[PDB]
Design a protein around this nucleic acid. Structure first.
Lengths: 77, 46, 63, 93, 102
RNA sequence: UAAGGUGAUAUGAACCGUUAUAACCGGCGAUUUCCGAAUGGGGAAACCCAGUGUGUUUCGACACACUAUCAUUAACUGAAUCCAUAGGUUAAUGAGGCGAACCGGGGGAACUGAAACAUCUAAGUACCCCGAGGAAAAGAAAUCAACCGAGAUUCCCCCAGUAGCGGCGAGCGAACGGGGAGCAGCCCAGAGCCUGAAUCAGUGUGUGUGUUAGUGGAAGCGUCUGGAAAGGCGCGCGAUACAGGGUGACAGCCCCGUACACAAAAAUGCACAUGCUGUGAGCUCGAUGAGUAGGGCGGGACACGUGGUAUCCUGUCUGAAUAUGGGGGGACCAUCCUCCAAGGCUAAAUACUCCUGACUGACCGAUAGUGAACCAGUACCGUGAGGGAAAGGCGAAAAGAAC
RNA sequence: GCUCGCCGGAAGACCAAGGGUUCCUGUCCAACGUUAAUCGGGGCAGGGUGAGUCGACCCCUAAGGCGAGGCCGAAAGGCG
C-alpha cells in the first residue's frame, strides 16, 4: 500500500456505467512524490513522501506537522 | 520404453520435504490439516 | 534413598555427582548387563534418590 | 583431561561372544561392545578413564541390529557397535 | 466410611460363599477383594519353572464381591454392626446400633 | 484422605508402605533432550560447522552461559561531514509461532432468482488477505422533530410488510415513535492554585459467597423354590431420603448413592471495606478541531438503482468563517427551529463456544449413533495435496488346556 | 554330483538410478511359491561385516532458488 501519511489516503474501489447502465469495476490510487524541507532541529535537510495535496497541508503549520504528526505515526526521514 | 514415476530420492524431498513445505504458507496448512485429521504420517518423503 | 543431613558443605555432595559419572553408573549398568546379584531393585537405587540431591544442588549457595 | 565426564556413557555391557576370553590367546587385540555411538574421538582414552588400562591401537565397527520384530506393529530394533583394541602386554579389558 | 477393613476378621454373605469366616488379603480396582480361605478355582496352569505343589493343577485363589461382607463378632459366629468415627487418625468404633432415634 | 500401592497389553520374579518422607487427592514450585516461532551461522526437521569469556592445557579440545531479527523509550560511540543521521552498543518495554466459533478493515465469482436477457437479483455470499477483543461494532448528537417536543448506544417484540424504492418488472423496504431487556458519563487540543480527592484496573489484607481435597448421615429377616433370590409366603421396618447403577433371577431398608449435618494450608471468579502502584477530582482563567465544510461533476453507500434526490462516503477541479459563524430540517428560495463536524474513550442487555467441573434425554444401539464403539484417520492407494476400509459381543467366577 | 543343451560385445563383469539383511548357520511351516515343499528374496533365533587416501563429504562453484541493506503490489505476492 502507498505511503500517504498526512492525507490518510488508501486504494479505493468504484464503478463505470454505460448508456445501458452496464457495470465495469475500477480502482483509484494515491499519486505520490518525495519533497525536501528545512526544520533546523535535525540540522540536516529532511526528505518526506506523501500523496498529492499533502505539502499544501504540511505548509499550513510550518514545521509542527513535520516534527510530530507526519513522522511519529508514519515513516522516518 | 517406461511408464509411471521415477524413483529418484532427491525429487522425493525437493517437492514435499519438511523444509520445502514449512518455507511456504500453504505448505504449513498440510501440517495443520494433518494434525487436525490426527494423521501420523505428517511427512511423506519416507 | 534417605539422609539425616540437609544442605551443609554441598561442595562434597556435588563431588559425589562426579563419581556418579566416573564409576557408580558404569559399574551398576555393567553388573546388571552381566546378570550379577540378580536384584531388580538394585538398578532402581539411583532414580528418585539423586533427584533429592540435584534439587538441593539447585540452591548449593549458602551451604 | 580434555572432555567432560558426562561423555563416558560407554562400555556398559560384556561382549556377546564366548570369543571374549580367547581373542588374546589368538592375537594381541581384544573385543568390546559399545552403544549406538562409540565415542571414536575419546574411546582410546576412555579405557584409562574407566579401567586404568591403556591400548596401542583402536578400531570401531557397526553390527546392524536387523528390523523384523512384530509382523504388523513393526517394533523398533536398535543397532550396536563393536571395538577392536590392541594390548601391548595385558589381557583383561 | 469403610465397612470391611483388613484390621480384623470378616464374614462373607455373598454369591458362592456365605456364612463363612476369613480376613482381607488385598483390594482390587472398582471395589473387589481377595479373602483368606475362600473356596478357590481348579486352574490348569500352562507349564512354568515355578514350584506348583505335588501332582497336577495349582488350585488358585479367586477374587470376590465386597458389597455383601460384614465384620465377624467371634462370640457366637455372627455378623456385628457398630459404626465408626474418628478425626485425623485410624478409625474408631462408635457403637450406635442401639435403636435410639424417633 | 490414610492402608494401601509400584500405567497398560502382561504374565513372572521383585520391591515400597500400613506411625509422620508408600501410592492417592487439593494447591504451589524444581528439572524440562533434539527438532519446531526456533533465535550463533549453515541444512536434507530431530543434522553439520564456529567464536568470545571462564576452567586447564606442553595449547589439541571439551564443559560452563552465551551470540537471531525489527520497532519504541533512555543514553554512549558514530560514514561521506561539518553539525546530524544510517551502522555499532547497554538497560527497559513491545512484536515473532499455533488454535474452535463469534468479530473489525480490505479483496471478491459463477451458477442462480427475473419461467429467455442485458439495469436489477445472485453477492459483498462462497472464498481469500491483513488483524482485534471478551466480546467486536455502536454511544453521551454539527440527529430527528415542527410549534407540541423527543433526546446517549444496543438487542428482542411492535410501528409494517406501512412510508417509500423498483427494466414500476421480478423483487426491495425505512426510520421517528410505543412495549421490554441493560443503567455511571468524561477527557484532549494548558496550566495555575488545589491535592489526593469521587473514582477505576491490577493485587494484598479482612469478611461474605461460588469453585478445586474430604468426612459424617434412615430402615428386611427367615423359609420354600432354584445354579443362585431381593420371587412366593409370613408379615415387617424407614422417609426433609423410593433417581441412576451394582451384589449368582428384578433388596426403599446388602452395597454405591440420595434428603440432612460440618469446615479452611494454598489457588481463583464475584461483592462490600480498604492499604499499595498507576491514572484521576475541584475551582479559575485560557484554547478550540481547515485541502475540509462549502461550490460543481463522476461513482459508491443508505430501504431508496438519478428521479420530481437531500443524507453519508470519496475520485477530481474549485475552496471558508468564528457564533445572527457554520452543517441540517430529503430539487430550490425566503422565513423559523435545531445541533456544533473537521479529535477520542466507555458497562451492560447483543454475537459465539475449542475448553474446567458436573447433570440429564418420548436419544441411537453395529446397514443406527461421530470417517471412526476394537492401538481406525490405522491398514491400503496416491508425484502430491488428498482420499480411506473390513473386523463390536462368554461366565457367578478365568475357573483357558493340568495331562 | 555328472551330462547334454543355450547366451557369449551377452543371457559375462562393473559404475549409476534405486533397493536394504537377502551375506554365513540352526530352526519352523499359521501365510507365499501358478503343480510337492524337505528349500528360502518366507516365519523365529544365532554368526560376521575396522578406509583421512574408493562413495558421501569438504574447499572452489555454473545455471539457478532464497535474500540483509533497498524499492513495488488493497493483498496472496513482485524484483534484485
Amino acid at each position: 500500500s502507498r505511503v500517504c501519511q498526512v492525507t490518510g489516503k488508501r486504494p479505493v474501489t468504484g464503478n463505470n456505467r454505460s448508456h445501458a447502465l452496464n457495470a465495469t469495476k475500477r480502482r483509484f490510487l494515491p499519486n505520490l512524490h518525495s519533497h525536501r524541507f528545512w526544520v533546523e532541529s535535525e540540522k540536516r535537510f529532511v526528505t518526506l513522501r506523501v500523496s498529492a495535496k499533502g505539502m499544501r497541508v504540511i505548509d499550513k503549520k510550518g514545521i509542527d506537522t513535520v516534527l510530530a504528526e507526519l513522522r511519529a505515526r508514519g515513516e522516518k526521514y | 520404453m517406461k511408464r509411471t514415476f521415477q524413483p529418484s530420492v532427491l525429487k522425493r524431498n525437493r517437492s514435499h520435504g519438511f523444509r520445502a513445505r514449512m518455507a511456504t504458507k500453504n505448505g504449513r496448512q498440510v501440517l495443520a490439516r494433518r494434525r487436525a485429521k490426527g494423521r501420523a504420517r505428517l511427512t511423506v518423503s519416507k | 534413598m534417605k539422609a539425616k543431613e540437609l544442605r551443609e558443605k554441598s561442595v562434597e555432595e556435588l563431588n559425589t555427582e562426579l563419581l556418579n559419572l566416573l564409576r557408580e553408573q558404569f559399574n551398576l549398568r555393567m553388573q546388571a548387563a552381566s546378570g550379577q546379584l540378580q536384584q531388580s531393585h538394585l538398578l532402581k537405587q539411583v532414580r528418585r534418590d539423586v533427584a533429592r540431591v540435584k534439587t538441593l544442588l539447585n540452591e548449593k549457595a549458602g551451604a | 583431561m580434555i572432555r567432560e565426564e558426562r561423555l563416558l556413557k560407554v562400555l556398559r555391557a560384556p561382549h556377546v561372544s564366548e570369543k571374549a576370553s580367547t581373542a588374546m590367546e589368538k592375537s594381541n587385540t581384544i573385543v568390546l561392545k559399545v552403544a549406538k555411538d562409540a565415542t571414536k574421538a575419546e574411546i582410546k582414552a576412555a579405557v584409562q578413564k574407566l579401567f586404568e588400562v591403556e591400548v596401542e591401537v583402536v578400531n570401531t565397527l557397526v553390527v546392524k541390529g536387523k528390523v523384523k520384530r512384530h509382523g504388523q506393529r513393526i517394533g523398533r530394533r536398535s543397532d550396536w557397535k563393536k571395538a577392536y583394541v590392541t594390548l601391548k602386554e595385558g589381557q583383561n579389558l | 466410611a469403610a465397612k470391611i477393613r483388613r484390621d480384623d476378621e470378616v464374614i462373607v454373605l455373598t454369591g458362592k460363599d456365605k456364612g463363612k469366616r476369613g480376613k482381607v488379603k488385598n483390594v482390587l480396582s472398582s471395589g473387589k477383594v481377595i479373602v483368606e480361605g475362600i473356596n478357590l478355582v481348579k486352574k490348569h496352569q500352562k507349564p512354568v519353572p515355578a514350584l506348583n505343589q505335588p501332582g497336577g493343577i495349582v488350585e488358585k485363589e479367586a477374587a470376590i464381591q465386597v458389597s455383601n461382607v460384614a465384620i465377624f463378632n467371634a462370640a457366637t459366629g455372627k455378623a456385628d454392626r457398630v459404626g465408626f468415627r474418628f478425626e485425623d487418625g485410624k478409625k474408631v468404633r462408635f457403637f450406635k446400633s442401639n435403636s435410639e432415634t424417633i
